Amino acid sequence: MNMLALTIILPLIGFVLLAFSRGRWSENVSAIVGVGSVGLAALVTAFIGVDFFANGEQTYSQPLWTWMSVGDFNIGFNLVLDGLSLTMLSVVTGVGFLIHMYASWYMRGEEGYSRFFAYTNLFIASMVVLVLADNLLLMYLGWEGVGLCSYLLIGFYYTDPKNGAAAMKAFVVTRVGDVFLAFALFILYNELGTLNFREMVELAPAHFADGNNMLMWATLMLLGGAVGKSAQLPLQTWLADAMAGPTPVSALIHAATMVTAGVYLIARTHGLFLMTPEVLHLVGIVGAVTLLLAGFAALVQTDIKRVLAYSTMSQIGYMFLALGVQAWDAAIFHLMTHAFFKALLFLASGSVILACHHEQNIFKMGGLRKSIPLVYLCFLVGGAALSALPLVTAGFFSKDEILAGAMANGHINLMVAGLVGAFMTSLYTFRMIFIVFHGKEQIVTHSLPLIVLLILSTFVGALIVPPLQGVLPQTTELAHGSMLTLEITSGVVAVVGILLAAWLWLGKRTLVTSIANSAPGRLLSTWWYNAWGFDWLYDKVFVKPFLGIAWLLKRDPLNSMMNIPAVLSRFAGKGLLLSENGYLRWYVASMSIGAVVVLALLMVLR
Amino acid sequence: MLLPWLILIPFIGGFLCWQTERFGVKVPRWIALITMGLTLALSLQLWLQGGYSLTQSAGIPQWQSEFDMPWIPRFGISIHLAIDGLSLLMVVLTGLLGVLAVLCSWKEIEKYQGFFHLNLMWILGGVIGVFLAIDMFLFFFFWEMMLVPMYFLIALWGHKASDGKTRITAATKFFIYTQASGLVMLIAILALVFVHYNATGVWTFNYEELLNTPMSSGVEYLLMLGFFIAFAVKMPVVPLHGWLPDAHSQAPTAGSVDLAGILLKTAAYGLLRFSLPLFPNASAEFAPIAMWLGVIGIFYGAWMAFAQTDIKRLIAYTSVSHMGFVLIAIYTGSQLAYQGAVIQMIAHGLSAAGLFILCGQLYERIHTRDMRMMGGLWSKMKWLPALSLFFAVATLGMPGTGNFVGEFMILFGSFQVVPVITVISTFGLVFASVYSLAMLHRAYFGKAKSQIASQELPGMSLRELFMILLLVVLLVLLGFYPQPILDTSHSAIGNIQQWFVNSV
Ligand SMILES: CCCCCCCCCCCCCCCCCC(=O)OC[C@H](COP(=O)(O)OCCN)OC(=O)CCCCCCCCCCCCCCCCC
Ligand SMILES: CCCCCCCCCCCCCCCCCC(=O)OC[C@H](COP(=O)(O)OCCN)OC(=O)CCCCCCCCCCCCCCCCC
Ligand SMILES: CCCCCCCCCCCCCCCCCC(=O)OC[C@H](COP(=O)(O)OCCN)OC(=O)CCCCCCCCCCCCCCCCC
Ligand SMILES: CCCCCCCCCCCCCCCCCC(=O)OC[C@H](COP(=O)(O)OCCN)OC(=O)CCCCCCCCCCCCCCCCC
Ligand SMILES: CCCCCCCCCCCCCCCCCC(=O)OC[C@H](COP(=O)(O)OCCN)OC(=O)CCCCCCCCCCCCCCCCC
């Protein structure tokens, strides 16, 4: 368990080697270095998990050095490992390793092979720093590194300026989230004097006995950082545009690393949120609203990868809903299962893109279950796990745990929102599946990760239980009758949604075309297609005034205001040079004028 | 003891650079390299022998080394040098940047290279003397003395693609700004000395003696205003800033002049060493105005940097925004914010040095600085766009670089003192990420927007790559292990902070 820092050192070494290789090595050697760095990190993670379970699930601490020490400001470079950290670390390392083998197969013949693998290795190292840190500033280091690697990997095809614009939009929105997280850090250090998670939880109830308002501010700013990183309301607009990068980038961002950081942040600082119940209820409300908006947005997307992006937003909203109803174990279980099936879905969509030679929209496809049967099978099991198909998928058990935690804690409206979102999830998922893979046809390094993610997307993934006892509090248990009727309701809702998608899109689209061609239907489709106009609102409220103020200030008005005395001096000198006309009689006249002035002044002031 | 040699080795080396040009045209660069290497080695020897990490705060004055000699005994003026942790860090940074400036102008085989090296050495010696002098007249003397070689370097050796008249205009504007503000500082120094003389009867310019000077409220405010006007011109603080982009634009193409005196931050040191201890009550009263000027400087510099089509002017306005952050840190009265300000000054020096060296080599390859005429340069160059990406990532304040450590300790201490200014400054960090990403997108990503950007370009030299990678290593080590730097400056920062808050 003393090799806990090796899970960061190996991806860092891979990034350094592949960055300084500069593409001069062979693609086999670059693939060996990158995939082997992430695989060795995963193997060290497996050994760490074996040691952790052999030691009775004891929280392990490994300091490395002291990051900074100015008086009472003490930030250490210390890693910690409990059940939550082990769960996130195993998910990140294993799913990133599978995505790395798929990228080694996928990115063959591309410019920037070594650069791609260096950036993904740095992404893995940053997320391991994020999940292994024991204080908020080291977690902020991992947070910002994850955001930077997201920016570097989204705009990987740098020749197209649209990819670059998507990368800058993702980085700017997540940077706003990180500024909110920085506000949380400043409040927590100013109040408690520490940023260590355990010490903050220990010192908070004694410090906030009289007043609790600054703790509410700190938890609200933590929620702001979380929704910035996890693409939730109101910082969700970056995800759909940021999907312009390569397919393994999207799999890594949406499944393993990038969007799970907010859920991990809320789960790690769960005690501080427990002392501020209104902010935790706001976390649940934000998750419910985000999942509903994301489901409605994914219902009308014409792109496979855009549907997958809004489905990721919906599932992260489900995780936030589980956090808000104090179902922490349900949230982490859904995080791990969603990582599995979302990685499977994104790799299958990349296989579709490579097979179709160009990124088509879903209506130009049809009858793809005959050209690619294995890709269709992977897509079918991934969509069944996404839609929470009962008794054969892990997503069903995860969403059942989330809804049971919501119902058992007295949150009825959040449970209703979760049920409606599950119905919509099955609706949009099998809408996209039936449009793409049904209709009339028009046009070892990768099978193994797809097979592993296929197996983990079934009930075998639900057989893996994260060791969250002793780290997160246990959710209040539901009665057997209530649990049974809730499982029945969830299965019925998912099956009815799949059947409605089959009735609407599997046959000829007549009632769907009747709805879409109607003026309310066109208006609602246009509204939901642009993700409810949030990007338009942020363009008209933040981007356009920024550009206008930059255009107004581009001539440096303060510089000209300070250049005004030079202009006045030049004008005064030119005006004073008129007296030097060279005329002697004027010089005598000016002498007599000065004599009059001097004598008059002397008689005045006497 | 070694402090006069720390000042005098640059001046003697510059004289030898000018004189030894008769033996060859490639001779003065070796003399300048030996000179700045010796100065850096002496500074590192002072760092090792000083024992700064074990030094505790004993109150102002507390000097780890001190030198005194009479200069003008009629006014009580002495060549009076003193070094402690903050001064030592600034002197080490000056020596390192001088070595980088010598190496950056290695390939210039001009017929008057000896005078170029003499001017560079005299600028470096003046900056070291500014950091070392604790005599008010000597401090002013070095402050104004290091501006004449800089004027002649900008006006005569400057950006050769531009017209001569633009170079003379930029050099004249820089000289007028700096020297007029210095004259205002001289008036403040003279009036403080006269107040001390009328209260004591002793002709002194010693900063240790002027610390305990009984002043009326309002007189102290005016003396503080004169000092702050000088330091605000050379920080820069808005609106006394435009000389810095005009001087960076018309600096010589290598970038050695950029590293020599335009980039070393003597004004924040002067604010910490002189403005706060001499006038603590006036600084405490001036604090809201100073932190709001810092906020305006952060956002104005960020917006100006975004609006530039010139990459050099973008880096200059980046420096303006960072100095707004440091100016906020100085007036908080917090130990954490002061240590963050020290880290931020060192990190800004390293990162801006890397950015200016990379900009100079980019201009060497492509013969233009307009970002509208480049684009997609990642595929055309071997090393330059990746290192430019690293340094632009550093200047937006990425953790792992020292800029993050500096600005975040600044913001932690400032939030402990003033929360609203802190939250506005963090949104300034969002603005910083915006302008750094904009520069990276406009320069190295996308498609080629002209003909010169569409051709393959020669790779960087081994020496150029060596010093850029040295800056990269130093920035990463400052990001991950800033504790030696924090321990070096801890006692001086503690003395300044205790003097500031124990007399208000
Ligand atoms: C954030 C990622 C995870 C962390 C590892 C990598 C971090 C970035 C690597 C580059 C910068 C490293 C700077 C620090 C190196 C270690 C030196 C150090 O801090 O020593 C202090 C400590 C002994 O002194 P102690 O008293 O315990 O410390 C408290 C302070 N008095 O020392 C010890 O106790 C021993 C510590 C040994 C640490 C070895 C780390 C090796 C890392 C190799 C990385 C290779 C790639 C480098 C570039 C990466 C990208 C920037
Ligand atoms: C720490 C754990 C994670 C926690 C979060 C950390 C977040 C902050 C991380 C900061 C580090 C810098 C991040 C951005 C670096 C980007 C560099 C890059 O793009 O390198 C790729 C490039 C090769 O790409 P390619 O396109 O094939 O080549 C150019 C075309 N011929 O490469 C090259 O062209 C050559 C190499 C260029 C520079 C590489 C990176 C330098 C900085 C890191 C290493 C510093 C040195 C190591 C030792 C440090 C001190 C011990
Ligand atoms: C999903 C969840 C999302 C949640 C989002 C919530 C809305 C956004 C909130 C942003 C700011 C949050 C600040 C939270 C921390 C506040 C901590 C604090 O101390 O608050 C109190 C402080 C006033 O303190 P004071 O009255 O001095 O007394 C306190 C002790 N004596 O009061 C303050 O510090 C409040 C300061 C508010 C400043 C608002 C205006 C600035 C906005 C950005 C400006 C910068 C960008 C624009 C460009 C400016 C160019 C000049
Ligand atoms: C500025 C615009 C931003 C973007 C749009 C935001 C829309 C927000 C819509 C919801 C309104 C705000 C949240 C609810 C009101 C405020 C909280 C409240 O009064 O809650 C009462 C109640 C729960 O009360 P109780 O369980 O007793 O709480 C104890 C814990 N403190 O009940 C609840 O908390 C009910 C929460 C239900 C879940 C929210 C989503 C469903 C209900 C709203 C539907 C419309 C939402 C927008 C469209 C979505 C797609 C259809
Ligand atoms: C207690 C609550 C219990 C549950 C109540 C119901 C919950 C919501 C259920 C919504 C889904 C119902 C299923 C049928 C409609 C959706 C499927 C459909 O017909 O889609 C058609 C079209 C998109 O089809 P497409 O494939 O893009 O078109 C191909 C041809 N061009 O789609 C369109 O063009 C738009 C279709 C809109 C259909 C009606 C939507 C009604 C709900 C709107 C909520 C708005 C937000 C809340 C209110 C805000 C304030 C007004």
Ligand SMILES: CCCCCCCCCCCCCCCCCC(=O)OC[C@H](COP(=O)(O)OCCN)OC(=O)CCCCCCCCCCCCCCCCC
């Ligand atoms: C164009 C650029 C330059 C700007 C113009 C030139 C400088 C203008 C300075 C104006 C000063 C106005 C003073 C008005 C009050 C005079 C009467 C008075 O109150 O005298 C008090 C005192 C004499 O009585 P005493 O017993 O000595 O008390 C000691 C008090 N400490 O008096 C004293 O002890 C002496 C007080 C001296 C005050 C400081 C004067 C210089 C301060 C620095 C420069 C001005 C401020 C910064 C620049 C402003 C904007 C350009």
Ligand SMILES: CCCCCCCCCCCCCCCCCC(=O)OC[C@H](COP(=O)(O)OCCN)OC(=O)CCCCCCCCCCCCCCCCC
């Ligand atoms: C060719 C044409 C163009 C070129 C020429 C342009 C004009 C050049 C000259 C401009 C400056 C004019 C003189 C400014 C100083 C005035 C001093 C003054 O009025 O002092 C009065 C009083 C003296 O103090 P007193 O009250 O006597 O103290 C003893 C008991 N308390 O003072 C006080 O009590 C305190 C007063 C403080 C405020 C007055 C000073 C304002 C300075 C403005 C500039 C600096 C603003 C702040 C920093 C901005 C950023 C650098």
Ligand SMILES: CCCCCCCCCCCCCCCCCC(=O)OC[C@H](COP(=O)(O)OCCN)OC(=O)CCCCCCCCCCCCCCCCC
């Ligand atoms: C939401 C409720 C809570 C509020 C939280 C705070 C606000 C969140 C806002 C989120 C959305 C931000 C979207 C930013 C998108 C930026 C990326 C983009 O669109 O880039 C396009 C453009 C590219 O520029 P360039 O590099 O020149 O490219 C060459 C040709 N395109 O790039 C540009 O034109 C540059 C765009 C710069 C945008 C700057 C945004 C600053 C945000 C400051 C937030 C302040 C909050 C407080 C406000 C006051 C409150 C009292």
Ligand SMILES: CCCCCCCCCCCCCCCCCCCC
């Ligand atoms: C003024 C110039 C400053 C340059 C940046 C310096 C940054 C600090 C580097 C310190 C060394 C870090 C790597 C070695 C760690 C040694 C640990 C010693 C204690 C065990």
